[PDB]
Amino acid sequence: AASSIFDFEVLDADHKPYNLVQHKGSPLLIYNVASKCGYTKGGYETATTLYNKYKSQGFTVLAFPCNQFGGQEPGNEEEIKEFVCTKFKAEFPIMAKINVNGENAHPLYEYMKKTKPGILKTKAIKWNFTSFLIDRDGVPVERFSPGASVKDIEKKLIPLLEST
Numbered sequence: 001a002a003s004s005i006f007d008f009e010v011l012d013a014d015h016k017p018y019n020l021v022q023h024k025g026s027p028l029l030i031y032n033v034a035s036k037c038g039y040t041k042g043g044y045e046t047a048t049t050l051y052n053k054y055k056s057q058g059f060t061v062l063a064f065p066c067n068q069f070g071g072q073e074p075g076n077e078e079e080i081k082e083f084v085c086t087k088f089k090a091e092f093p094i095m096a097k098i099n100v101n102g103e104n105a106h107p108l109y110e111y112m113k114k115t116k117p118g119i120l121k122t123k124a125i126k127w128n129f130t131s132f133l134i135d136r137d138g139v140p141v142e143r144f145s146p147g148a149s150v151k152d153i154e155k156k157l158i159p160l161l162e163s164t
Contacts (some may be wrong), residue, residue, distance in 0.1 A: 003138075004021060005028075005111070005112070006021050006024055007022070008107055010064075011095065012093060012094070015046070018093065019096065020068050023058075023060050024138055025164075026057065027133065027134055027135055027161060028134040029060075029125040029132070030134060031047055031063050031064065031129060032063075032066045032109075033094075033128060034065065034066065034073040035070070035073055035080060036072040036074070037070070037127075038126055038129075039127070040072075043146070044087070045103075047092050048061075048091075049150050051092045057161055060092055061162070062095060063095060064106070064112065065094070068090070068101055070128075075083070079139075080085055080094060080097075106113030112132045113143075116132055116143040133157060133160070141156065144157050
């Protein structure tokens with residue numbers, strides 16, 4: 001039905017519509033994020049490292065803040081924007097806070113989760129810092145677990161970059 005991530009509308013952290021289709025033609029990594037998680041440090045470091053290392057090939061990281069896992073994203077978008085830039089020097093796009101699970105789950109997440117299920121084919125996001133790898137057609141090709149390393153993600157990202 002939906003054929004890519006570009007069939008969906010998302011708000012950036014400033015609550016204006018985000019120009020999502022600018023990333024079409026090259027792969028992306030999309031995280032759901034939290035500021036007060038045990039994965040926050042490792043999560044933002046991996047995201048940044050991958051973003052810096054593959055920026056020039058048209059690769060980006062999008063971060064969707066989410067407060068559904070232990071309530072570990074309590075702050076507003078401006079507070080999140082500041083924390084993220086001061087601590088980690090993350091220069092990638094930070095989006096508006098959303099739900100990833102349930103009746104108010106963002107349509108884009110329902111699509112990614114359905115395309116790339118978790119443990120035992122279950123759809124639900126299990127925690128903060130789950131990521132989806134997206135290909136050049138805007139189709140999700142991998143789900144990564146919270147804690148997934150740079151090298152774990154490169155295993156799939158590198159062959160993807162060399163494609164098309």
